[PDB]
Symmetry: C2
Subunit: 80 residues, 2 copies
């Protein structure tokens, strides 16, 4: 059905995420994302899960002086 | 309410098992057993709505169970 990049970018536009890099990682997808509002990042990951893309690795750390924001240290998704 | 009360009540509401909850001032370091990722995120969202932010999170998928993860690091901030 839809290619993963289409879903990822449509949902990134909806939830306010900036994609620095999207590249394959074996059969998975590695995403490099600019620092983000954690609530918006969770809403985006939930939308990707609804499109059949599970979160294989996620590591985030709060941004200094902005506790509700996080640096996305690692993000890897599985294809649908 | 004390942060541990909210954290433990909400973990039980989302089926998550806490095996260590260690205070570090305004930060709380947790050790959580492997979990359904959607439930883990729902718990963190409910904690955020109660004023407790996710300061550090590191998870990796469970091999052969893709919707599940191991919670390698979890630190919350009150």
């Amino acid at each position: 059905s839809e290619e993963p990049s289409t879903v990822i970018m449509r949902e990134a536009a909806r939830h306010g995420l900036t994609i620095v890099r999207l590249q394959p990682q074996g059969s998975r997808l590695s995403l490099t994302v600019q620092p983000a509002d954690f609530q918006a990042l969770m809403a985006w990951l939930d939308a990707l899960g609804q499109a059949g893309m599970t979160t294989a690795t996620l590591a985030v750390t709060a941004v200094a002086q902005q506790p509700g924001w996080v640096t996305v240290n690692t993000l890897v998704l599985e294809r649908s």
